[PDB]
């Protein structure tokens, strides 16, 4: 009632949260762009999203995806949307449906090669998925290249129990290189973060031929980031990305919370700042 206007299912043990991205045109052609693994969550809030899901068998993946397709075909669904699934062992089950672009659509773009939002616009203009200009291949021809991990740098401070810090960003230095994509939010040098809207500064996604390769690039990038003026969730994300159970690729919704270490952060001195403190002090 507090969250929404309005005021029961079988609980599940240690599931894996899997979504499938779908595109359908005005001409009854529907396609799926494979899954994404959002099993990494904090208090059931998505944190790090990965695609494709490494830990499932292709046979299974296709079952789930084909399930999603069948549903959206059944509704004659138009444009882009996502079908979420929960997965245990070799049984999967429907959870929800999002009839929109999702935050984590980037990673799917990166493994399929398909610009989703460009496609959204072509579809709203009505073109068929497989037109020349739209250049979406027939489903059989849609494959996975590599894997991609996305993490969202936000002003949530983990020492202050993830209270979105506010203020002016005096220094914002982003990263780049092979297999790095950035989708900028409220993230440039001058900007001030208000508390009114959400905390997100920049979305950082990295790609690799192997997920192990992508994880490396994510690590480097997260360290490379220099943001000052506000607290961020980077040190948290680093701990989750460094954690060996994350690199294994076998985790579940219960992976966070179950592991407290991630919430312990290294007590880092910057010799540099303290030096400026001295210099500034004696100067005044």
């Amino acid at each position: 009632k507090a969250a929404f206007g309005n005021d029961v299912e079988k609980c599940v043990m240690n599931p894996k949260h899997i979504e499938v991205q779908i595109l359908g045109d005005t001409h009854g052609n529907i396609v799926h762009l494979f899954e994404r693994d959002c099993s990494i969550q904090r208090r059931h809030q998505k944190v790090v999203e990965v695609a494709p899901c490494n830990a499932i068998t292709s046979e299974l993946r296709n079952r789930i995806c084909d399930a999603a397709v069948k549903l959206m075909k059944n509704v004659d669904y138009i444009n882009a949307g996502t079908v979420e699934f929960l997965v245990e062992g070799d049984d999967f089950y429907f959870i929800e449906v999002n009839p929109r672009v999702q935050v984590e659509h980037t990673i799917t773009e990166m493994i399929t090669g398909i610009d989703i939002v460009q496609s959204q616009l072509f579809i709203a203009d009505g073109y068929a998925l497989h037109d020349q200009l739209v250049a979406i291949p027939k489903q059989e021809d849609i494959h996975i290249h590599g894997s991609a991990i996305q993490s969202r740098i936000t002003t949530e401070d983990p020492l202050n129990n993830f209270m979105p810090d506010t203020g002016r960003v005096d220094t914002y230095r982003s990263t780049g290189g092979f297999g790095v994509r950035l989708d900028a939010g409220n993230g440039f040098q001058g900007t001030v973060v208000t508390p009114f809207y959400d905390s997100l500064l920049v979305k950082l996604c990295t790609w690799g031929m192997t997920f192990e390769q992508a994880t490396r690039k994510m690590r480097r990038n997260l360290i490379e980031f220099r943001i000052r003026g506000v607290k961020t969730n980077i040190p948290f994300l680093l701990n989750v990305v460094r954690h060996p159970d994350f690199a294994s690729g076998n985790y579940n919704t219960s992976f966070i919370d179950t592991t407290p270490e991630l919430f312990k952060f290294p007590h880092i001195r910057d010799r540099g700042t303290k030096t400026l403190r001295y210099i500034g002090n004696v100067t005044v």
């Binding site: 999002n98 009839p99 929109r100 672009v101 999702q102 935050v103 610009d115 939002v117 460009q118 959204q120 616009l121 072509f122 709203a124 203009d125 009505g126 073109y127 200009l133 989708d183 900028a184 939010g185 409220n186 440039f188 900007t191 001030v192 208000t194 009114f196 809207y197 959400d198 997100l200 920049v202 979305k203």
Partner: protein
């Protein structure tokens, strides 16, 4: 690209920008909308045009002023509207 010549981006922040980028890549003019508290957000500078929306409204309520947005959409010459995600992305009344 055919019948969309110009598009309104009925959102803010990261997602707003991504859309603009898409449009521009497709030679489509773009229009942004910003609340009073978002006069500063750089998504508004990334469009071809921009207008304030949620006048006097509480900051979250501002991007949900459906009617206002259509007036803005109509005055702009916007052939279409992209609601991004969150806000009016799933709102029926607006879609209708």
């Amino acid at each position: 690209m055919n019948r969309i010549k110009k598009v309104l981006v009925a959102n803010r922040g990261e997602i707003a920008i991504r859309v603009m980028r898409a449009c521009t890549e497709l030679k489509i003019k773009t229009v942004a909308i910003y609340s009073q508290e978002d006069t500063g957000s750089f998504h508004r500078y990334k469009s071809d045009e921009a207008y304030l929306v949620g006048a006097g409204k509480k900051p979250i309520d501002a991007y949900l002023d459906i009617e206002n947005i259509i007036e803005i959409a109509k005055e702009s010459g916007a052939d279409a509207i992209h609601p991004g995600y969150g806000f009016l992305s799933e709102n029926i009344e607006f879609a209708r």
